[PDB]
Design a protein around this ligand. Structure first.
Ligand SMILES: C=C(C)[C@@H]1CC[C@]2(C(=O)O)CC[C@]3(C)[C@H](CC[C@@H]4[C@@]5(C)C=C[C@H](O)C(C)(C)[C@H]5CC[C@]43C)[C@@H]12
Length: 256
């Protein structure tokens, strides 16, 4: 029944709003020269980075650890969202952990695109905006952490998804079932099939002039995969040349 799929979409969207403090809708209102209400302080170089530390509250490394923090917070938020997905907490606990382990980074880059445009990315709950060029200009093992994320975002943002779309898409990603190490794949797959039906209907209703958006959205999952892969191998480099830099245990247990 279409009706049941709509109720599912609304529940996920509702849970999404409750779990993620910075929505795409708020991010777009901040980014677009829309408001005096609160536009961001813009960090595009060293001194503005400093002054930025006063307005908003070594460079390259310190920025990297600022990233590390926000990812941890993002993992907490995504974990909270995951529990609201019907069926998820009824799964074998080990599989819940596995689904989170592999899904969380793909979600983080999906939602990261909401905070990006071509020029840079919102930081600190949208109070700040850090320039793409400034991130690229950073010291050499760090200066290209962010670039492939920008490249993803620019293309992904061209699908023009809104938060109600993204809420279902993010659920679809979590409930994959082709994740390494899963004990019971069939209950995961039955949940994903429901989610996929919901997403498909959502996209047809919300974007009726956007043909095959559903298929085009699913194809984006390959882009996410390779961002993660490339990000991971970049992290292995950093941990060897920067022996004094530390990773977060919540983040470290995710990579393996
Ligand atoms: C170890 C890291 C540096 C964390 C976990 C890996 C990470 C990850 O997988 O998230 C790569 C992308 C990103 C550096 C995050 C942190 C969160 C962060 C984000 C949102 C918040 C802090 C930063 O100020 C800013 C604006 C550059 C963004 C952009 C990218 C990421 C997603 C990484």
């Amino acid at each position: 029944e279409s009706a049941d799929l709509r109720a599912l979409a609304k529940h996920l969207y509702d849970s999404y709003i409750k779990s993620f403090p910075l929505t795409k809708a708020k991010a777009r209102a901040i980014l677009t020269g829309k408001t005096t209400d609160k536009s961001p302080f813009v960090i595009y170089d060293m001194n503005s980075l400093m002054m930025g530390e006063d307005k908003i509250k070594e460079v390259a490394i310190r920025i990297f650890q600022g990233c590390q923090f926000r990812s941890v917070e993002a993992v907490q938020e995504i974990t909270e969202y995951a529990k609201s997905i019907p069926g998820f907490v009824n799964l074998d606990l080990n599989d819940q952990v596995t689904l989170l382990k592999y899904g969380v980074h793909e979600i983080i880059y999906t939602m990261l695109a909401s905070l990006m445009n071509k020029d840079g990315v919102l930081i600190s709950e949208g109070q700040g905006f850090m320039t793409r060029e400034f991130l690229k200009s950073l010291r050499k093992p760090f200066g290209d952490f962010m670039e492939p994320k920008f490249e993803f975002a620019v293309k992904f943002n061209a699908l023009e998804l809104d938060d109600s779309d993204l809420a279902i898409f993010i659920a679809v990603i979590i409930l994959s079932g082709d994740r390494p190490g899963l004990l019971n794949v069939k209950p995961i797959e039955d949940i994903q099939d429901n989610l996929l039906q919901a997403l498909e209907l959502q996209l047809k209703l919300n974007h009726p002039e956007s043909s095959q958006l559903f298929a085009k959205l699913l194809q984006k999952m390959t882009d996410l995969r390779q961002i993660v892969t490339e990000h991971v191998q970049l992290l292995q480099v950093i941990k060897k040349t920067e022996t004094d830099m530390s990773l977060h245990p919540l983040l470290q247990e995710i990579y393996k």
